[PDB]
Write an enzyme that holds these catalytic residues in place. Structure first.
Site, PDB file in Angstrom:
ATOM      1  CG  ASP A 206      -2.008   0.794   1.400  1.00 44.23           C
ATOM      2  OD1 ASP A 206      -2.853   0.703   0.146  1.00 44.23           O
ATOM      3  OD2 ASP A 206      -2.002   2.019   2.088  1.00 44.23           O
ATOM      4  CD  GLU A 230      -2.960   3.096  -3.187  1.00 44.43           C
ATOM      5  OE1 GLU A 230      -2.220   2.931  -2.567  1.00 44.43           O
ATOM      6  OE2 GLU A 230      -3.486   3.126  -3.821  1.00 44.43           O
TER       7      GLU A 230
HETATM    8  C1  LIG Z   1     -12.614   9.721   4.038  1.00 44.10           C
HETATM    9  C2  LIG Z   1     -12.921   8.491   3.763  1.00 44.10           C
HETATM   10  O1  LIG Z   1     -11.709   7.997   5.099  1.00 44.10           O
HETATM   11  C3  LIG Z   1     -11.929   6.336   5.465  1.00 44.10           C
HETATM   12  O2  LIG Z   1     -11.158   6.357   3.927  1.00 44.10           O
HETATM   13  C4  LIG Z   1     -10.395   4.475   3.882  1.00 44.10           C
HETATM   14  C5  LIG Z   1     -10.149   4.074   3.431  1.00 44.10           C
HETATM   15  O3  LIG Z   1     -11.752   2.809   3.244  1.00 44.10           O
HETATM   16  C6  LIG Z   1      -9.368   2.122   3.864  1.00 44.10           C
HETATM   17  O4  LIG Z   1      -9.735   1.745   2.373  1.00 44.10           O
HETATM   18  C7  LIG Z   1      -7.948   3.030   3.628  1.00 44.10           C
HETATM   19  O5  LIG Z   1      -7.694   3.313   2.172  1.00 44.10           O
HETATM   20  C8  LIG Z   1      -6.751   2.354   1.982  1.00 44.10           C
HETATM   21  C9  LIG Z   1      -5.006   3.411   1.305  1.00 44.10           C
HETATM   22  C10 LIG Z   1      -5.060   3.863   2.969  1.00 44.10           C
HETATM   23  O6  LIG Z   1      -4.499   2.618   3.663  1.00 44.10           O
HETATM   24  C11 LIG Z   1      -4.692   3.483   0.558  1.00 44.10           C
HETATM   25  C12 LIG Z   1      -4.669   3.315  -0.534  1.00 44.10           C
HETATM   26  N1  LIG Z   1      -4.699   3.833  -1.532  1.00 44.10           N
HETATM   27  C13 LIG Z   1      -4.598   5.579  -1.608  1.00 44.10           C
HETATM   28  C14 LIG Z   1      -3.544   6.182  -2.167  1.00 44.10           C
HETATM   29  O7  LIG Z   1      -2.476   5.130  -1.203  1.00 44.10           O
HETATM   30  C15 LIG Z   1      -3.042   7.580  -1.277  1.00 44.10           C
HETATM   31  O8  LIG Z   1      -2.699   8.036  -2.461  1.00 44.10           O
HETATM   32  C16 LIG Z   1      -4.664   8.274  -2.032  1.00 44.10           C
HETATM   33  O9  LIG Z   1      -4.824   8.647  -3.301  1.00 44.10           O
HETATM   34  C17 LIG Z   1      -4.953   9.836  -3.922  1.00 44.10           C
HETATM   35  C18 LIG Z   1      -3.504  10.019  -4.843  1.00 44.10           C
HETATM   36  O10 LIG Z   1      -2.798  10.173  -4.712  1.00 44.10           O
HETATM   37  C19 LIG Z   1      -3.957  11.914  -5.289  1.00 44.10           C
HETATM   38  O11 LIG Z   1      -3.514  11.550  -6.304  1.00 44.10           O
HETATM   39  C20 LIG Z   1      -5.028  11.477  -5.987  1.00 44.10           C
HETATM   40  O12 LIG Z   1      -5.084  10.709  -6.963  1.00 44.10           O
HETATM   41  C21 LIG Z   1      -5.668  11.153  -9.007  1.00 44.10           C
HETATM   42  C22 LIG Z   1      -4.301  10.485  -9.367  1.00 44.10           C
HETATM   43  O13 LIG Z   1      -3.102  11.307  -8.909  1.00 44.10           O
HETATM   44  C23 LIG Z   1      -4.668  10.930 -11.065  1.00 44.10           C
HETATM   45  O14 LIG Z   1      -3.523  10.860 -12.102  1.00 44.10           O
HETATM   46  C24 LIG Z   1      -6.001  10.653 -11.422  1.00 44.10           C
HETATM   47  O15 LIG Z   1      -5.743  10.804 -12.788  1.00 44.10           O
HETATM   48  O16 LIG Z   1      -6.710  11.344 -10.125  1.00 44.10           O
HETATM   49  C25 LIG Z   1      -7.107   9.954  -9.124  1.00 44.10           C
HETATM   50  C26 LIG Z   1      -8.386  11.528  -8.631  1.00 44.10           C
HETATM   51  O17 LIG Z   1      -6.470  10.554  -5.522  1.00 44.10           O
HETATM   52  C27 LIG Z   1      -6.493   9.519  -4.342  1.00 44.10           C
HETATM   53  C28 LIG Z   1      -7.649   9.350  -3.802  1.00 44.10           C
HETATM   54  O18 LIG Z   1      -9.089   9.833  -4.632  1.00 44.10           O
HETATM   55  O19 LIG Z   1      -6.050   7.654  -1.453  1.00 44.10           O
HETATM   56  C29 LIG Z   1      -6.360   6.525  -1.908  1.00 44.10           C
HETATM   57  C30 LIG Z   1      -7.315   5.864  -1.413  1.00 44.10           C
HETATM   58  C31 LIG Z   1      -5.364   1.843  -0.933  1.00 44.10           C
HETATM   59  O20 LIG Z   1      -5.914   1.221  -1.721  1.00 44.10           O
HETATM   60  C32 LIG Z   1      -6.637   2.235   0.501  1.00 44.10           C
HETATM   61  O21 LIG Z   1      -8.333   1.350  -0.582  1.00 44.10           O
HETATM   62  O22 LIG Z   1      -7.940   3.905   4.057  1.00 44.10           O
HETATM   63  C33 LIG Z   1      -8.715   5.049   4.131  1.00 44.10           C
HETATM   64  C34 LIG Z   1      -8.168   6.558   4.741  1.00 44.10           C
HETATM   65  O23 LIG Z   1      -8.527   6.317   5.944  1.00 44.10           O
HETATM   66  C35 LIG Z   1     -13.336   6.371   5.253  1.00 44.10           C
HETATM   67  O24 LIG Z   1     -13.817   4.802   4.930  1.00 44.10           O
HETATM   68  C36 LIG Z   1     -14.048   6.087   3.937  1.00 44.10           C
HETATM   69  O25 LIG Z   1     -15.626   5.580   3.772  1.00 44.10           O
HETATM   70  C37 LIG Z   1     -14.218   8.122   3.711  1.00 44.10           C
HETATM   71  O26 LIG Z   1     -14.510   8.616   2.734  1.00 44.10           O
END
Ligand SMILES: C[C@H]1O[C@H](O[C@H]2[C@H](O)[C@@H](O)[C@@H](O[C@@H]3C(CO)=C[C@H](N[C@H]4[C@H](O)[C@@H](O)[C@@H](O[C@H]5[C@H](O)[C@@H](O)[C@@H](O[C@H]6[C@H](O)[C@@H](O)[C@H](O)O[C@@H]6C)O[C@@H]5CO)O[C@@H]4C)[C@H](O)[C@H]3O)O[C@@H]2CO)[C@H](O)[C@@H](O)[C@@H]1O
Ligand SMILES: [Ca+2]
Length: 476
Positions: A206, A230
């Site tokens: 992750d 990831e």
């Molecule tokens: C605010 C949220 O908080 C929690 O959300 C949880 C989630 O339910 C859980 O599964 C885990 O979440 C996990 C985590 C944390 O251990 C990380 C990895 N996933 C992460 C990425 O590691 C991170 O980098 C960022 O990711 C960002 C990215 O860094 C940013 O660059 C942009 O990403 C861009 C990208 O850069 C661009 O090139 C493209 O075009 O657009 C996307 C949107 O937004 C993404 C978020 O949507 O968030 C992702 C969810 C995993 O797969 C993911 O399941 O923890 C989070 C935070 O508490 C709650 O449970 C949710 O109900 C609530 O809505």
């Protein structure tokens, strides 16, 4: 298992809490909006291994195993495994250490691999960043192991991205100072031990862009097995370079153009063709990336379009592209939930039907992939090449000359008209007979080397030499 071993696998990714319960129920309530533990367990995965293997997968990826924060937070329970507090103990909601071990050995007995999701970036805490009590974490019991509290305001500032905290004021994720040697040393020692203790074959890591690059080379080496990272970014110039510090990364660069090409009958084949080529030339090794169109961080494909022909084509792409195929549990049952938490649906509610439309398509696509690599030691290192495109079609070729698979994908949809595509560039010889392995019909190569492919219903077509299917059970 090594990077070379992993090139030939195909993965079924599932959330332990949401795949199968120990009691085998198919009707136990799991409202995604509640964000609670729904009851999935490692034993339940064991009981449904025939369901999984029957689609032709050779591996599974399961969410994090470590013990989590115990509270029901304002965002629900830590059912997903990403909010750890004690890295030396297991999340008891999924079973015991013996259950985890039982899982690995039930996979291995069937010739299948186990991949485990791991987090090194942070821990989880019920409450605001300022108010954290560092004494609850094991073993990182002090604020000195962590970065000073700050939230990530600007995702374009790499410094903030690595040194500030993910999460928020509701559920905060204390960020480890991975530049300190005590932190590095502890993580390197844990990762090797986890792998040897549970006989894990590969790891999904992750939050890789949130930890400085120089940490990873030693983690990958301590783990001693293939690591796929990831890096959530669609730019191949940002994500691919991570392949210089870890075996592979998830293919987010291809994800965007792939979804856009098939989510509507007006999707662009051009953007997809160009990205295939870019990743091919610009990533260190395309054959070590993981291809996908669905996961737990984005809306499911069917939330975008309920058209079943478009869903068939995108699933065929995933299995037949370069790299390792990754399907997310529920995709094969045509699940349609939107953003988190609605894309964390319980697989059991489907009743696990093995005669669903995508279950069959997937099984047939994995069947030809598995058979081809059995016969062509160059299939996995031959780089996929797009040989043709038009406004509603893309065709590709992969495999050693003479044994190549030619896949013809369409975004016309379930209403698509019936016509004959005369395909050039396939590389088969004149008069050769070919089998279309999805619908099991035959086609003959024309005298000029062109293939007359019958198109209809927006269906995907996958071609392979009839003579080579000799002794196989495909299209028997
Ligand atoms: C605010 C949220 O908080 C929690 O959300 C949880 C989630 O339910 C859980 O599964 C885990 O979440 C996990 C985590 C944390 O251990 C990380 C990895 N996933 C992460 C990425 O590691 C991170 O980098 C960022 O990711 C960002 C990215 O860094 C940013 O660059 C942009 O990403 C861009 C990208 O850069 C661009 O090139 C493209 O075009 O657009 C996307 C949107 O937004 C993404 C978020 O949507 O968030 C992702 C969810 C995993 O797969 C993911 O399941 O923890 C989070 C935070 O508490 C709650 O449970 C949710 O109900 C609530 O809505
Ligand atoms: Ca960090």
């Amino acid at each position: 298992a090594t990077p070379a071993d992993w090139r030939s696998q195909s993965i079924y990714f599932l959330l332990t809490d949401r795949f199968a319960r120990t009691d085998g129920s198919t009707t136990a309530t799991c409202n995604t909006a509640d964000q609670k533990y729904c009851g999935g367990t490692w034993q339940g995965i064991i009981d449904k291994l025939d369901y999984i293997q029957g689609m032709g997968f050779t591996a599974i990826w399961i969410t994090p195993v470590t013990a989590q924060l115990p509270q029901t937070t304002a965002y629900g329970d830590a059912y997903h495994g990403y909010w750890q507090q004690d890295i030396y103990s297991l999340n008891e909601n999924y079973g015991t250490a013996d259950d985890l071990k039982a899982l690995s050995s039930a996979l291995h007995e069937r010739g299948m691999y186990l991949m485990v999701d791991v987090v090194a970036n942070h821990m989880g805490y019920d409450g605001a960043g300022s108010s954290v009590d560092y004494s609850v974490f094991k073993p990182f019991s002090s604020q000195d192991y962590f970065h000073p509290f700050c939230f990530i305001q600007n995702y374009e500032d790499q410094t903030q991205v690595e040194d500030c905290w993910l999460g928020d004021n509701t559920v905060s994720l204390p960020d480890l100072d991975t530049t300190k040697d005590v932190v590095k040393n502890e993580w390197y020692d844990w990762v090797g031990s986890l792998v040897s203790n549970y006989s894990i074959d590969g790891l999904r890591i992750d939050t890789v862009k949130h930890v400085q690059k120089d940490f990873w080379p030693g983690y990958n080496k301590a783990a001693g097995v293939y690591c796929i990272g990831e890096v959530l970014d669609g730019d191949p110039a940002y994500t691919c370079p991570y392949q210089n510090v870890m075996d592979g990364v998830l293919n987010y660069p291809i994800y965007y153009p792939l979804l856009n090409a098939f989510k509507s009958t007006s999707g662009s084949m051009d953007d997809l063709y160009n990205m295939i080529n870019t990743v091919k030339s610009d990533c260190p090794d395309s054959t070590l990336l993981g291809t996908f169109v669905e996961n737990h961080d984005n809306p499911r494909f069917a939330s975008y379009t309920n058209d079943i022909a478009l869903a068939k084509n995108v699933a065929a792409f995933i299995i037949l592209n370069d790299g390792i195929p990754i399907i997310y549990a529920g995709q094969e049952q045509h699940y349609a939930g939107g953003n988190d938490p609605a894309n964390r649906e319980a697989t059991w509610l489907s009743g696990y039907p093995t005669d669903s439309e995508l279950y069959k398509l997937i099984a047939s696509a994995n069947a030809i992939r598995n058979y081809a690599i059995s016969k062509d030691t160059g299939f996995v290192t031959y780089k996929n090449w797009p040989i043709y495109k038009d406004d509603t079609t893309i065709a590709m070729r992969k495999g050693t000359d003479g044994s190549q698979i030619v896949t013809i994908l369409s975004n016309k949809g379930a209403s698509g008209d019936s016509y004959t595509l005369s395909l050039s560039g396939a590389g088969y010889t004149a008069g050769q007979q070919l089998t279309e392995v999805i619908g099991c019909t035959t086609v003959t190569v024309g005298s000029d080397g062109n293939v007359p492919v019958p198109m209809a219903g927006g269906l995907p077509r996958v071609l392979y030499p009839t003579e080579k299917l000799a002794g196989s059970k495909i299209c028997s």
